[PDB]
């Protein structure tokens, strides 16, 4: 009673520069993309019949092809378009999973001002999206993820960690003043696909730095929660957003061997291990979408 | 109304290195090891009371005390104690999930033998283990997910791919002769905890590289199926099994422009984009255990 | 006749991150740190005598120590003092090689202004030093390399290719526009130690920056001789950059079998393999300094 | 006075897979080769007049037209034969350094055989050379660099510290019993390019292995010498080895806090900082070859 269960294909990092010049002024998009069609491929995986299977060769294709016939904005609205345009072509298809991020980029600055066309990396994380469409017609549903991934950030005070859990193997000081640093990897869920992507976006990123720097933090778990919980107030349209970050541990290196005070001055900023710290918060009032998340962050 | 959703805190990536030592002839365990704890820790990130939370820094503290206490044999072994000690340190805790990853090591060569203290990295993909355990006496539950990452294989011949679906974006060639190269990740379930972890992840992985070989590929689709179908069938202990691949495109370079043949012998190893083709193969007589699955193989 | 030849050692990626909190609007250093010590180390090596080997451990010691009792400021400084501190504590030394990396942090915007204590990684490049310092007392002699490393930057016109030579594997087509992008590594080595390093630093970056964008390139090899120029030009108490930049290939995608066309817009950003060129910039009228570069960037 | 300096340019990291399929027993080549050239290359640069210039891409294509031309057996051969070609086909080249990894791949194993087209990654350090040809006909020299990269290896006793220089920031215990684990970069020099290349590199392989494994160590500088003086004086055709090592630092976790001893069996391998020790073993006898070093292992 052995059968294929659970099942999905596609091309992964297609990268994608998209450039706009139509006037001496140009803008890029650089953007990674994967792309994963589910649906009837039984026979692909069993008999080896590959009727039903569009070529990953050709999904990647059409990235290319759709970045100049759709044109390249809010990255969104491209792995929709994506999302819809392998339905059409894939009678087998039941959904497609799309996924991309983006890196960011700055005008080079030249006497004040940015140059037309040269550019350098803004090198402070990557924004995501998930974008997941199912059916088609009056059945066709569509999910929309937004995230960004590897914001490192740092506070150097306002960061306690006390009144913990104490058993025979715990050896951790209780402190009032510690660093608290991570690199922040979020993604959250939009409750319909009716959203200005860059505005929303922009107020997410802004707001979950503030809280991060202006809380008064008794726990990186309490940090967490409070800027998701602050994303919801302010944007209705969000439904969940979950937070994963790290304890990037600074230690505070005893310098008394050596003769020398340490009044949190001089730190070892540790690779590994790390505590991980990982939250979700959510609307009570909206149901759940476990479509929206199905192989992500991968597929096992 | 707005509230915490689902969480889980602990260690990650804890670098344990065992060493056998009873006789002159060491034996090594290099071992990556990540805990997460679930359970009560709501007022922790709404209020911040601590009160509840084991530090993750205790759960580090935790991996080298059981090491040397418990002892490292099976990976899937020491992942269990670890969940049932913290449920036994944490009383707010519902449940944990221990992830464990092992670096093989070969005996150092001198004259024919194997060195008793001296060793190499054996270089051929990483064993991994993910346990959940889940309640305490009567009401414990437990999984075991065992698995193999970054397990570097290729054919040169046997594979082929043709007669898949074209539309208008396809420039892909059909063909009956191809490199099938991937870098395989694989997951499998165990029915229970009564196994010979060893013997079993031995025999698992040998059919996979022997399948691997051996079937005529119509489709890295259905060499994946073939693989996980064929563990199956070996293992009745093994209730399903979930496989991802990429297709690690070899193109044949183009000669032609230089006057010269190319039969299937010079080849462009791209790096990306590469094809990724995931599959699932499970009993159908079973039921499933998303518990296992939960956060596998990542939060969000 | 075997002899031990050029040897050094030390302590390699010391992460220190230091913190200046006399005044509530904290300032952070974030480093990483390498020390080797060269001078006479024979019997180390040879008959295994430790005599004269200051433990690599006590140069990571250092690095803290020194690190709250001189202070961080620039980090050419900072190397310098290092250098000859392991001078004066380890009689066997002949020389001390210090090289640092520093990441920059950019304060949290809040409200308009930067949070007092909490950062977020800037993401555009490394700055780096190399200082070496050899003998003591009136026989002392010091170096400083400074440099910029994974400084990712990219023209989308102002830069062409043609003229080139053509042999019988050449297939490249002449090309008046085309995408120049780059992760530029670059070295530059001071003539004396007596120089305001901050000053010089943000000036250079900005001369490589502002020459990259607006120069018109017909090779990136001129690109770089154009850079190095303004470099040399502008800094007269600099004797000699060395620049290191892959041309990262953005190919211009065939839409044609889609039926479109593409006039500069689709590009497939390619990761491997990439154009390696390579140059330096020298002041014709002074000497060089093999001691400033020796085992620069590795010993082998 | 400020002029163009030393340069160099060509194409890095081009991935070549050459398979050997006369019979149905296939052998795999798999290779990462850059080429780079030097030469008057000063208009280029200065100018922008790349008539001298032959295209990095152009040297991409020559690699894979060779690979079926001349074939691909040592990686010394190969790279010589591109360092030819070059001086053949770019007149104002003086000069090329061709670099090169190998990949090891093994046969799968199927009822004790090694398949005929069914391979695995070795996984076990890569195998590199380093090819420097200068000037033509009678003018032409030519220096060949092999060596080994990433070879992680360990012993798990048989290592001690002790005895060394003890200064006020001194802390570390002198020791007569730790791990010593690394993981090998070398790369030595032939004195002429008449060797058997691959009866070599397994001679030199090994007894590296064997010596570390076997050589009771006072120091890792020890250590490495006693490596490389054992290969010297085994391959009189060899010049001089160099070697690096970081001391990768598995540190005894103290279990004195939790009621346990620690007797050498449990430890926590940190990843930074790690003792970096680097050597040369020469032939007193022979004299050096800076040309064959040059720009190895960078340019700057
Ligand atoms: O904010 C924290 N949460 C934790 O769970 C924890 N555990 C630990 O060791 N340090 C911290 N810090
Ligand atoms: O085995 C394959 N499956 C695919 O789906 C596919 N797509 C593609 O382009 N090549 C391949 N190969
Ligand atoms: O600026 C360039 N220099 C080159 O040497 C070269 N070679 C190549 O293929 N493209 C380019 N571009
Ligand atoms: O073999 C070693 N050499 C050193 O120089 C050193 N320094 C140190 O701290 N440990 C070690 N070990």
Redesign the interface.
Known sequence: ?????????????????????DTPR?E?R?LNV?T?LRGD?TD???????????????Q???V??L???EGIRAIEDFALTLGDHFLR??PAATGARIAIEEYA?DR???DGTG?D????????GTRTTVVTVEGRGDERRAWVLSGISD????????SE?????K??????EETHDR?LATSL???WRYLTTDVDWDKTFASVR?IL??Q???VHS?????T??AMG?AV??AHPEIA?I???A??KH?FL?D?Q?????????????????????????????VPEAPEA?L??????
């Open positions: 009673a052995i059968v294929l269960g659970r099942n999905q294909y596609g091309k992964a990092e297609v990268r994608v520069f998209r450039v706009y010049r140009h890029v650089d994967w994963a491929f692909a995986h069993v008999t080896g019949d590959q009727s039903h299977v569009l070529p990953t060769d050709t990647k294709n059409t290319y092809a970045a100049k016939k072509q894939v980029w080079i600055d030249v140059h066309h040269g550019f350098v990396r803004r090198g402070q914001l490192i950030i740092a506070k150097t005070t306002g960690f006390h009144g913990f859990l058993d025979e193997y715990t050896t951790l660093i990897h979020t993604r802004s730095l503030r991060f720097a202006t008794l726990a990186l778990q309490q967490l929660y919980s919801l107030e969940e979950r937070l994963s790290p304890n600074h290196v310098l061997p050596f003769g020398l005070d340490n009044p949190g001055e001089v730190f070892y900023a540790s690779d590994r291990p790390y505590g991980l710290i990982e939250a979700s918060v959510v609307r009570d009032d998340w192989a992500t962050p991968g597929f096992c």
